Symmetry: D2
Subunit: 211 residues, 4 copies
Amino acid sequence: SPSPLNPGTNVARLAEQAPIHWVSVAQIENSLAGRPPMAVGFDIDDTVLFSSPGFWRGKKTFSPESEDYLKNPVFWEKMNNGWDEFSIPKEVARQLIDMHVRRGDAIFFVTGRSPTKTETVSKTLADNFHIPATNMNPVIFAGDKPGQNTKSQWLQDKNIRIFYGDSDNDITAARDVGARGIRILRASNSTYKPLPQAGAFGEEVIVNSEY
Amino acid sequence: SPSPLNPGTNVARLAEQAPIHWVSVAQIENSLAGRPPMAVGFDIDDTVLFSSPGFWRGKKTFSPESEDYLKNPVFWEKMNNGWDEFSIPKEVARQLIDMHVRRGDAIFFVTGRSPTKTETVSKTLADNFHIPATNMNPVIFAGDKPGQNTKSQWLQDKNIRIFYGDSDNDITAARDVGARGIRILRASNSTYKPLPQAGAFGEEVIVNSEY
Amino acid sequence: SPSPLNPGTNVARLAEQAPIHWVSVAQIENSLAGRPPMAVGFDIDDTVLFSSPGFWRGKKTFSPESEDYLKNPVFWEKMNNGWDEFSIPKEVARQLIDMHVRRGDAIFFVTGRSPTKTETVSKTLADNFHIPATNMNPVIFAGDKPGQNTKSQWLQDKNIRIFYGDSDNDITAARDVGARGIRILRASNSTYKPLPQAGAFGEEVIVNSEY
Amino acid sequence: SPSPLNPGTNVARLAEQAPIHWVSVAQIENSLAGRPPMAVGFDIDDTVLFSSPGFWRGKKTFSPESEDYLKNPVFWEKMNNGWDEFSIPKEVARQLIDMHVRRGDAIFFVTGRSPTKTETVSKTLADNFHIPATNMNPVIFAGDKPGQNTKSQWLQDKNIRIFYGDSDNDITAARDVGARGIRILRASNSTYKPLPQAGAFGEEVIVNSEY
Ligand SMILES: [Mg+2]
Ligand SMILES: [Mg+2]
Ligand SMILES: [Mg+2]
Ligand SMILES: [Mg+2]
């Protein structure tokens, strides 16, 4: 934009692959065969939930021309107490959570969302992903503080050994504590842009994980 | 057949292309050079709005174990009177609508959603896509119920010359009346499954139109 | 080169399509249903034959540090009198030639190779592609003359209505005479580089035609 | 199942990735930082040379209606004593060989080609890949005939630590002796079909290695 009307292509380009370590859920499960129960963790937004609907409504409602809504407690109170009714669960997360429950793993959610007075997100997640009481843990609302990775200390405190996420800070949080960081693709219709460069730390990336 | 742990791949598969007539917005615009203002139409769901958030919420709320919510007046009243605040506008639609408005074309929206006593979808569309009053037209609810007209009939009635849509029936509606049916890709995280085979009738398909 | 060790990617990029009019042999055949026999034409190199072996040997033998071999009659005499024994027929060409024979079309080959005193290329092609005597025509060695498209006059003289080729000059030769130019992908292991931008004239490009 | 004229596609399919451990030459080089000179090995056919031109010519000449040419001493004498002048060196091999030569590694070639009284393949490889005398080693012909040793046995004998190849048996040869087997993609225009499933054993596969 502007760009050629008819750009064309060639077969080198058509076949070209980025050097990324792609994995499947089955390969992950296999890599863990025989490992006793451990703590694992998931980012929420664009990892287990397509939550752009609420973030989109939030932006339009609270800061149509800026990102200020993300620092607005009135927004977080809406986002954490019912707007996830419009959040669409990701199939990759159904498969991963089922797999970790099968293993007897403890499941944590560690999100950059700000903490609120009350939250119904933990219930939404347990219900939608059919997580038994024993495997489920209340969502950790780690917040966002420029200059800090707010998730890293939580991964250490909960002894989380595998952390799934869509953002660079999810992968580097895992790296910070020596955990296995595994990338989920953010959907291209997410309102959180630009899309991250999945694989840019040499981490495993789950195939087809945009849905 | 087994789904092997390590299925591998090969370069025939990597380079394989489906025989699709892909087009860009710029190519479509070029094809209309010198053509006077005309009526054009858009399907709504998965064409201009990723509306799955409301449909997802509707299914959970009104028929968690069936598709009955789609025949439930209580759902439609919610879906057509505010749940599109959580619908995510598609960039392909922003570009198409901008291009057609610039041409002075009349913009119509023709949806298979069930009609309701009131609807705020028209306003949502005009506001989000910055459609001037002179180009905007209230949403048309098309279908097979008594007193309704089909998508085809509405295309005919409004002399719509190009119809954009994600579903097979959008393309056939256009074909049935000699209009130009152009396909938009349904996002893979849509809750309306299975995904259509874009290009199934040899129609033009807009590149990168999943977002 | 140099470039990031771990470049990563994202799902917009993974799904991204160039706006190209891809077609299959079956679609081409269907587009011609009911059309009586006509003359059609094929480029040779990287269209029907992977002839890089001979061109590679030629370069090494006659001009290791330049492109001068392509103006050397000693090279052309080798290339046109047996080095095509090492040229690998393309499956796309088997399918197209079979289809055109089925139609009763007259088949021509129009190549940028230079003419020689004798040539066994016509025999190689008739033999390998099982072309009956009635459909077969002796190869036209049109040569290469910077500033001219040497193929265009031949397409006009033989009333060729469809011309298949891998190079830009094949497509523009067709355009020059009002014929239907259809692009075949040059294989990425061809020694003729850079690869052309297939589709850069808005022409049809045959899927999977690199082999 | 029908192969429809207009099969269409969808964005799940467009974005679909096989779970492959893709790597680049730069990543492999990085993994060897600080490692002293070692022996490394390459398969020949479809790993470093696109040798299909000679194999194609051999099949046509010696067994047009079978695979018997591969057991024909007359073919092998031609194939190993000059027909590689028509073989096209692979760019991936240029990069790997350059990288390993720069490391001071010993370069071995281990092929399943039948042995002959004389062979000029070693010279072809040294000349085309600019392999210095100190790094070069004569081609090893491995197999199951009396007095031969298998690829595995030769890897063991030469203490080859990394083995590059296109076929399953190249990867298993490395695996059988605890060497690092790294896969190169076989070009889709190779006459050796079907193409292998690169990554079938969870091994590293070099990106873009079809040329
Ligand atoms: Mg996230
Ligand atoms: Mg729709
Ligand atoms: Mg050519
Ligand atoms: Mg090989």
